[PDB]
A paper describes a structure:
When the reduced NADH level is elevated, NADH is bound to a Rex protein, causing it to dissociate from the Rex DNA operator. TmRex forms a homodimer, and each monomer was composed of two distinct domains: the N-terminal domain involved in DNA binding and the C-terminal domain involved in NAD binding, which were linked by a flexible loop (residues 78–83). The last helix α9 of the C-terminal domain was mainly responsible for dimerization through the formation of a hydrophobic interface by extending to between the N- and C-terminal domains of the other subunit.
Subsequently, the native structure of apo TmRex was refined to 2.0 Å resolution with crystallographic Rwork and Rfree values of 20.40% and 25.83%, respectively. The refined model contained four TmRex subunits which formed two homodimers in an asymmetric unit. One dimer formed by subunits A and B was well ordered because of crystal contact stabilization, and the residues 4–208 in the subunit A and the residues 9–208 in the subunit B were interpretable. Particularly, the glycine-rich loop comprising residues 55–63 was not visible due to the lack of electron-density maps. The initial structure of the apo TmRex was determined at 2.8 Å resolution using selenomethionine-based single-wavelength anomalous dispersion (SAD) data set collected at the selenium peak (0.9791 Å). The refined models of TmRex contained either two independent dimers (apo and NAD+-bound forms) or one dimer (NADH-bound form) in each asymmetric unit.
Author numbering:
A (entry chain B): 3 to 208
B (entry chain A): 9 to 208
Write the structure that this text describes.
């Protein structure tokens, strides 16, 4: 157990870079080439990638496909992640019907709401809206890893606290508020994205 | 840089709605997941004007960054793709209140064309996309079609004079105008990377 696993930030950088090389059609890449694309010392790259042994190598370079597969494996890309969605409104339902994430390994196995007129209706094929009163019990019983928050800002922090109390490991947050929890959070906010976009549009003017 | 400024702006906006007058770097650090030292470095751009004591003047920074971001301007949008995501964006009303107004939505599906995607918004034939964009002076194109057709839609938008693109398709678009991507699956993937790191 001597050659060390590369640290997370490195692995993620390799992974995204290898992903580009794959889209480009590159089968073999050298450490020197990785050094230039990643702005990272070639000796470090070789040290890192030696973790994968001869399997990682093809010819005078590295097997782009082998490394993409192996690093993805370490990063949980081959894991089937279990999600729940809280909020069965516009956004929640859209996420429940977003089929392509299912291809990629993200499985929504429950969706919850507090509205009696929503509970019991189908949010998506094979997915029935459950009473949010059951959220903690369900997240614990099914070992749910990711909670998607799709409720209005007013109840987002409360929902987030219930999820982490129930053992959620990460949260994807669509509510227009910054949630404060111990677990990692990724936010999606179409308005924030639009503000970034429009700043860049205006910035082009000289 | 744009992404950081908006993160501040969205936060400060919330704090105003919350009624907070002064916020500390530490409180900003918890909400924005950045180093308090980083927040202090960032917000130093606004000088003593941004400061109240050792903390920050919420209203001062909201206004100043709003100024930098051009928040006063109204933007005209169209959505291409009237499926699950496109319908969802069309019905996302708070962005309309923030000055991003969707005035058209398009699809190539006859079952969808003619029907209403949202209140007051009827789905148009995507064949008329360019014509609509030019005639209505549309500034922002939202791409909500599958990855396979996203690049060509982006090309049609750009030829019609679009100024920027918001892209929901899981593919990298190649055009001359600015592009911002929302990729729910990619965001989930980023999240899982951190989950995995924390469980090792």
């Amino acid at each position: 157990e001597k050659i060390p696993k590369p640290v997370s930030k490195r692995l993620v950088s390799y992974y995204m870079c290898l992903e580009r090389l794959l889209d480009e059609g590159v089968e073999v890449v050298s450490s020197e080439e990785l050094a230039r694309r990643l702005d990272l010392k070639a000796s470090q790259i070789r040290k890192d990638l030696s973790y994968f042994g001869e399997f990682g190598k093809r010819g005078v370079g590295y097997n782009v496909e082998h490394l993409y597969d192996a690093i993805g494996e370490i990063l949980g890309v081959k894991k089937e992640w279990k999600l729940v969605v809280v909020g069965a409104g516009n956004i929640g339902r859209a996420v429940a019907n977003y089929t392509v994430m299912k291809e990629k390994g993200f499985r929504i196995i429950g969706i919850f709401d507090s509205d009696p007129s929503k509970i019991g209706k189908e949010a998506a094929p094979g997915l029935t809206v459950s009473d949010v009163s059951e959220l903690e019990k369900f997240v614990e019983e099914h070992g749910v890893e990711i909670g998607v928050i799709a409720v209005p800002a007013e109840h987002a922090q409360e929902i987030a606290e219930r999820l982490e109390k129930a053992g959620i490991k990460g949260i994807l947050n669509f509510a227009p508020v910054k949630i404060k929890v111990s677990v990692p959070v990724e936010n999606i906010d179409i308005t924030a994205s639009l503000r970034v976009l429009t700043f860049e549009i205006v910035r082009r003017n000289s």
